[PDB]
């Protein structure tokens, strides 16, 4: 649409020092009619190099991308979330890949936890099959294919292992 929105959250300290956050929402219909938005966020302290930068794009190729950069210059930490629909072998299919660059050691805990402890447990509490491995070390994919309007097979590619299940009947149509 073109417009922008500016939001400032300011905490007035006693010192009079500048404290707070400024966000600037952007949005358009860039490149080829497909919607776009961005969110930038900086601290109000002129001393700060912190910056959160988040981008969205709804591509032509029925994709939906979105990256997030935060930290030193909103380029210290990165995390993407790419989603596509389409056909895998003549069957409607869908896909989401959560990728990540460097993560603050903190969040690294959360990930390495849910990928090493969480996942196997959800996988067996759902009784999924379990192959030796799915490639890419800083990635997570999920592929959904409707074999029939109600039957779906799902593949979950983690760094160290693939989980999968075929012939899942749903309570609704895909």
């Amino acid at each position: 649409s073109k417009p922008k929105v500016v939001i400032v959250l300011r905490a007035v300290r006693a010192d009079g020092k500048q404290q707070g956050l400024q966000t600037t929402l952007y949005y358009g219909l860039t490149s080829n009619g497909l919607p776009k938005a961005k969110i930038v966020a900086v601290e109000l302290s002129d001393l700060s190099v912190w910056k959160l930068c988040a981008k969205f794009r709804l591509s032509a190729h029925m994709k939906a991308k979105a990256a997030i950069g935060w930290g030193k210059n909103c380029q210290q930490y990165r995390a993407m979330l790419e989603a596509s629909t389409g056909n895998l072998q003549s069957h409607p299919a869908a896909r989401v890949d959560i990728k990540w660059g460097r993560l603050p050691s903190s969040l690294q805990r959360a990930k390495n936890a849910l990928l090493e402890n969480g996942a196997p447990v959800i996988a067996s509490k759902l009784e999924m099959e379990i192959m030796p491995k799915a490639n890419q070390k800083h990635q997570v994919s999920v592929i959904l294919a409707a074999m029939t309007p109600r039957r779906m097979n799902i593949i979950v590619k983690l760094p160290k292992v693939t989980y999968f299940q075929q012939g899942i009947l749903l309570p609704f149509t895909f």
Partner: protein, 955 residues
């Protein structure tokens, strides 16, 4: 068997204790020890006189001798227990019991507990036998084993009662009218299992069998979850020992001839509402107690909710239940001009649930004392919260005749739907609903068809839909599609409501509803919408495999694709249910689906569909199901109607929770001797049902600056607004006698108080004097605000023994309080596209969510309460000693999340001490004590203000 002229002297001790069945935790209960004499008379009667009674309460660990005297307030009751009681007794069967009217039913029920031991159905030479036998608990399956003891003439008899296999079970309920029995869930688990075993040493003497000693043991075991997830138990025991038999001189019978009925326990009048589990009301000054707690609620919840406000509201309600409509009127009279007392009182009315509340209400409405807005909040609350009786139903009928209600559309609507709900609740427990209850509604439907007033036909069908009675089927069928050669005189709208009106009916007679809706569904000449609705009704009635197959075969050749899409998707979706309630229907659908191809699953969004989703947890034996229906038209992409419902299952029952529908026929039509009924064509309509009962519906037909200057003026002068609300969210109660003759009481009460206050003052500048809205929307509007929204909710669950004067048992109390505050400034300018808030920050640690849980055992009487925690504070490297513990260990949790931008943190603290150390069971995990806090806290950067500013537009 008591020989005329003979006095048999017995000692009698009995008790009933509630709690967790574990040695070491505290339990509470009631007990007595008496000496009794029974004098045999002629004509197969005898008189029982209690000659000495010591009442006790039990409060402590079990086993233990923590029995103590019940002291004050019992003299009158003890004098009543001591009046002679006549009873008929022949060949060991108790017949009628007679006691003076001053001897209260409570006192007679305790006597029936003693007499119950003397019920001996011995069949002369059969060693083991069984029969449905009357006792204090009702008529249940009883088995006897008769053996020879060793002294001579002496026999050992032992009988046992299966209290879940009864031709007649004595019990009362409140709050369970909308619960529907889920047969499958009940075969998986039974929530209240009870059994009693009586052990006797008996002497076979020519006079007849005489008891030398009796001991009973009875267990009432409540499983709120699966049976292995922990139970709460009431254990009762009686001991009766013959101490002597004496010749008694020349008669002159001294006992009453007032017949008080048979051996089965008799519930004192209105006990289910009047006699509270939590509060002793007998013997107190009622009007006074009501005045004090009413003052406390009004006065203490002005800026924020008082922590105990929901419990005082529960107290207020318990006291109101004990006064008639006259006392209500005297209270209202003194306080109806005080805005806050007034509001608290009208909140309290619906919660009372008694017919006196409804009479007060009828009188207040008729004298024009309530506004339209108050009337619509209350007419609503009151009718539906009634513990329905015949008087309730009369006052409700008279209410529909009140001008104040009749002259007001939304109120008349609410009162009529409410009257339907009131019929449903009254009839819920009976085999057959008395016709006169439905009369007001069949009369309205008959007069609405005579006047050919479509709106009125709709309202009556919906209300009859609420009343849910099979007696209505013949009246509803006149309005259904295909009931003859067709006499097209009703719109699709009326027909659709006539089909939906069968739903609650199907909960009682599903076969009779299936017979009606299946031919409708199968009729290819009927409009799609109407067939689809008949399919919704059909499936909700849980059809058999064969019926569902008939439908699936008819679909192979269905000419209407809307109908085919819908039915095919409902069957496919239900076939995947994993919830027990839908097990049988889902297997029926499994089988049916094999009868056709899957091509209808390719139809898209332009096609009608049904989706069922559900989930069930085997350990809690609880679950939730949801459905969503979209009826589409060929006319276009906007749906003709959409509905979604959510339902719950637990403890072997199920209920609808909430359902919403929307229909939008006209909207569609605009986007793309007899007398026909003129069709009001609503652009759109909608309704909402709660527990299966339609509580409001509305239509959107043709609804497509003095009023504002006043508000700005009001706003410039400053406004203080307070809205509090007190309410009972749910109240379920099950009462039943235990073998000693006092009732056990299982009670779930959830109540809540909400308080919201706002002070607002607005500022503007060069606003034109002839201001319009548009001038407002173009200036700097400065709004100073001091506002608080807070809420407290208490859930109390009780299992124990209850009488008017002494209550004992186990209680778990869950309380949650939340509240947020905001003092600052909001500066807006609609045209400059700029918004600005300047809020004072939290200065200190501020608790925003406080949640506690406490499990206790209690004894309450007029002297007040004695309470112990269920888990005794103390009894009997790091890891080991903690885990391998015979005692509860306090656990502690505490998260954070810091805000740099705000120099403030939001913390979550919690302290837990439960019973999991005793058993790996769900109930034991939530039994104990818990305190959790969500709070916000500073650090020192001393934020002065916190500004949130937004700017859209060009800048």
């Amino acid at each position: 068997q008591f020989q005329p002229g003979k006095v048999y002297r017995y000692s009698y001790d009995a008790f009933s204790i509630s709690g967790l069945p574990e040695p070491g935790v505290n339990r509470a209960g009631l007990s007595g020890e008496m000496k009794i004499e029974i004098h045999g008379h002629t004509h197969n009667q005898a008189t029982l006189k209690i000659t000495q009674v010591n009442l006790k309460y039990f409060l402590g660990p079990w086993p233990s001798d923590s029995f103590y005297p019940l002291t004050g307030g019992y003299d009158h009751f003890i004098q009543q227990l001591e009046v002679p009681v006549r009873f008929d007794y022949s060949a060991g069967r108790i017949g009628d019991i007679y006691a003076p009217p001053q001897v209260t039913d409570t006192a007679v029920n305790i006597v029936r507990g003693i007499l119950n031991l003397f019920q001996l159905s011995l069949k002369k030479n059969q060693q083991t036998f069984e029969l449905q036998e009357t006792g204090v608990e009702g008529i249940c399956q009883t088995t006897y084993v008769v053996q020879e003891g060793y002294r001579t003439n002496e026999m050992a008899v032992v009988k046992t009662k299966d209290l879940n296999n009864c031709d007649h079970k004595v019990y009362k309920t409140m709050g369970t009218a909308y619960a529907e029995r889920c047969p499958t869930c009940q075969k998986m688990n039974k929530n209240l299992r009870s059994t009693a075993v009586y052990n006797y040493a008996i002497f076979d003497e020519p006079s007849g069998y005489i008891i030398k000693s009796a001991h009973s043991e009875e267990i009432q075991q409540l499983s709120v979850f699966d049976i292995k997830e922990g139970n709460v138990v009431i254990e009762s025991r009686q001991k009766l020992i013959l101490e002597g038999i004496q010749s008694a001189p020349a008669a002159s019978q001294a006992a009453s001839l007032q017949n008080r009925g048979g051996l089965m326990y008799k519930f004192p009048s209105s006990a289910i509402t009047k006699m509270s589990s939590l509060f002793v009301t007998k013997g107190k000054n009622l009007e006074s107690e009501i005045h004090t707690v009413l003052k406390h609620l009004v006065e203490n919840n002005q800026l924020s909710v008082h922590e105990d406000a929901p419990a005082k509201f529960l107290r207020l309600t318990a006291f109101l239940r004990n006064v008639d409509a006259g006392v209500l009127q005297s209270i209202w009279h003194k306080l109806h001009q005080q805005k806050d007392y007034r509001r608290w009182i009208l909140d309290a009315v619906p919660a009372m649930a008694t017919s006196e509340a409804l009479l007060f209400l009828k009188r207040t409405l008729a004298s024009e004392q309530l506004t339209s807005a108050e009337a619509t909040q209350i007419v609503a609350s009151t009718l539906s919260n009634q513990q329905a009786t015949r008087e309730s139903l009369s006052y409700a009928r008279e209410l529909l005749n009140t001008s104040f209600i009749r002259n007001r559309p939304i109120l008349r609507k609410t009162a009529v739907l409410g009257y339907g709900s009131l019929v449903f609740r009254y009839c819920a427990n009976t085999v057959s609903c008395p016709d006169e209850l439905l009369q007001p509604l069949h009369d309205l439907l008959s007069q609405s068809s005579d006047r050919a007033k479509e709106e009125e036909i709709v309202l009556a069908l919906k209300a009859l839909g609420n009343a849910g009675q099979p007696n209505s089927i013949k009246k509803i069928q006149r309005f259904l599609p295909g009931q003859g050669k067709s006499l097209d005189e009703y719109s699709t709208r009326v027909q659709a409501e006539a089909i939906m009106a069968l739903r609650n009916i199907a909960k009682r007679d599903p076969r009779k509803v299936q017979e009606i809706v299946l031919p409708i569904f199968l009729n290819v000449a009927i409009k799609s919408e109407l067939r689809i609705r008949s399919c919704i009704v059909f499936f909700e009635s849980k059809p058999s495999v064969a019926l569902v197959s008939m439908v699936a075969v008819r679909l192979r050749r269905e000419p209407n694709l809307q109908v085919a899409s819908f039915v095919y998707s409902q069957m496919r979706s239900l076939s995947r249910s994993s919830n027990p309630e839908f097990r049988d229907v889902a297997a029926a659908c499994s089988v049916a689906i094999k009868m056709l191809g899957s091509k209808l699953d390719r139809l898209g969004c332009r096609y009608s569909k049904a989706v069922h989703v559900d989930t069930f947890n085997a350990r809690t034996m609880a679950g939730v199901s949801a459905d969503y229906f979209r009826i589409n038209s060929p006319s276009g992409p906007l749906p003709r109607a959409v509905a979604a419902k959510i339902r719950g299952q637990g403890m072997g029952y199920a209920s609808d929770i909430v359902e919403f529908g929307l229909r939008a026929e006209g909207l569609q039509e605009l986007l793309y001797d007899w007398k026909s009924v003129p069709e009001e064509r609503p652009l759109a309509s909608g309704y909402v049902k709660v527990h299966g009962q339609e509580v409001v519906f509305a239509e959107l037909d043709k609804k497509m600056q003095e009023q504002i200057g006043a508000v700005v003026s009001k706003l410039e002068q400053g406004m203080d607004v307070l809205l509090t609300k007190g309410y009972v969210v749910s109240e379920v109660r099950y009462m039943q006698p235990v073998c000693i003759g006092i009732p056990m009481d299982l009670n779930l009460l959830v109540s809540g108080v909400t308080t919201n206050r706002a002070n607002l003052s607005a500022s503007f500048s060069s606003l034109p004097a002839d201001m319009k809205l548009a001038d407002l929307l173009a200036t700097n509007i400065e709004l100073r605000v001091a506002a608080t929204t807070s809420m407290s909710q208490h859930a109390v669950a009780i299992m124990g023994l209850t009488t008017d004067l002494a209550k004992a048992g186990m209680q778990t109390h869950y309380k949650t309080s939340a509240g947020l505050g905001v003092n600052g400034k909001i500066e807006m300018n609609a045209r400059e596209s700029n918004f600005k808030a300047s809020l004072k920050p939290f200065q200190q640690k501020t608790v925003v969510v406080l949640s506690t849980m406490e499990s206790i055992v209690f004894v309450r009487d007029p002297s007040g309460s004695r309470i112990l925690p269920v888990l005794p504070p103390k009894m009997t490297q790091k890891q080991i000693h903690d885990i391998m513990t015979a005692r509860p260990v306090m656990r502690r949790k505490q998260s954070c999340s810091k805000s740099a931008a705000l120099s403030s943190k939001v913390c979550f603290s919690a302290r837990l001490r439960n019973a999991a150390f005793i058993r790996n069971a769900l109930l034991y995990k939530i039994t104990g004590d818990y305190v959790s806090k969500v709070y916000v806290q500073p650090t020192s950067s001393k934020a002065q203000i916190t500004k949130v500013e937004l700017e859209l537009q060009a800048g």
